[PDB]
């Protein structure tokens, strides 16, 4: 789950829906990414009204996971497939000003601060 050469979903605003995983990165011999991991992406498909180009390369942060996410002392939540939020190449943070879906409250790290500048559930 969230391996190289296998497809991913988008949670960033007005630029792509369907994208390709090309690097798992973040250290040494790492695998099977959780929410808050950064992944290297190519835009497998775009649409002409959006802000992005097909075949262009960038990073994204994981926000929806087929392996789910842990936080409370005795309950685990999981979803269908895997989705990520697209990042700016050299200044970091999410590209858009809004995010699709309920996503995660477990992710708050300072590289992705825009996620607490929003309210996806409540």
């Amino acid at each position: 789950m969230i391996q190289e050469q296998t497809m991913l979903n988008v949670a960033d605003n007005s630029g792509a829906r369907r994208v390709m995983c090309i690097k798992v990165l973040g250290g040494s011999h790492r695998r099977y990414a959780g929410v808050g991991d950064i992944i290297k992406i190519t835009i497998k498909e775009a649409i002409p009204r959006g802000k992005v180009k097909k075949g262009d390369v960038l990073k994204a942060v994981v926000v929806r996971t087929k392996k789910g996410v842990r936080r409370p002392d005795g309950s685990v939540i999981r979803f269908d497939g895997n989705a990520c939020v697209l990042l700016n190449n050299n200044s970091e943070q999410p590209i858009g000003t809004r995010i699709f879906g309920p996503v995660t409250r477990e992710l708050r790290s300072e590289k992705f601060m825009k996620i607490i500048s929003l309210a996806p559930e409540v």
Binding site: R71, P72, D73, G74
Partner: protein, 209 residues
């Protein structure tokens, strides 16, 4: 400094109102008794010896009964020795309980690995297995060539080779003491701990740095 013996009685998620799940291994101690203090056996050093209830005192034969002939006259099924420091000791038979770990944060535990028989080189040393097509002929579980080619004409020493597995000394020295229950003589330590439920597990304070 001293020690005790006990057995594994459970492995449970204990919970908190603090947002942590806390898995613990549960250990119940034998309430083991002192046999003697061992002084003037190594220069500038001291130790304590301990034993437990034999269950059947007729199982000690002449060559093993001697361990208990220096502890009164009869039986105890096992013998254990632990180091002493910063004082001299006199003993009559007083019990050792879990209360020695009420402020000590980490322990040193001798658990030992499970029995696996021959176990197979393919798992005992993670030795590889590929598909049977376009590959190996009739010998696919063995540790490769154990001999040295040509000039040395001898078996390579310390090479990962065939044998037996299990009942090997596995020790853990960084595990967290979670809770003591003194009236029930019970010890709770964080996460999993190796050893069978029949094994007498040795517990000491940690001296790992």
């Amino acid at each position: 400094m001293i020690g005790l013996v006990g057995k594994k009685v459970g492995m449970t998620r204990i919970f908190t109102e603090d947002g942590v799940s806390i898995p613990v291994t549960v250990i119940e101690v034998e309430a083991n008794r002192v046999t003697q203090v061992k002084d003037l056996a190594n220069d500038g050093y001291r130790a304590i010896q301990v034993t437990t209830g034999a269950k059947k005192a007729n199982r000690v034969t002449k060559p093993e009964a001697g361990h208990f002939a220096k502890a009164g006259v009869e039986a105890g099924r096992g013998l254990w020795e632990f180091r002493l420091a910063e004082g001299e000791e006199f003993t009559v038979g007083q019990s050792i309980s879990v209360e020695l770990f009420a402020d000590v944060k980490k322990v040193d535990v001798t658990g030992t690995s499970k029995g696996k028989g021959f176990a197979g080189t393919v798992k005992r040393w993670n030795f590889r297995t590929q598909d049977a097509t376009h590959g190996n002929s009739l010998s696919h579980r063995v540790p490769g060539s154990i001999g040295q080619n040509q000039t040395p004409g001898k078996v390579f020493k310390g090479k990962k080779m065939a044998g037996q597995m299990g009942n090997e000394r596995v020790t853990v020295q960084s595990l967290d003491v979670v809770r003591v229950d003194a009236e029930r003589n019970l010890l709770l330590v964080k996460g999993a701990v190796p050893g069978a439920t029949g094994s007498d597990l040795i517990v000491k304070p940690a001296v790992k740095a």
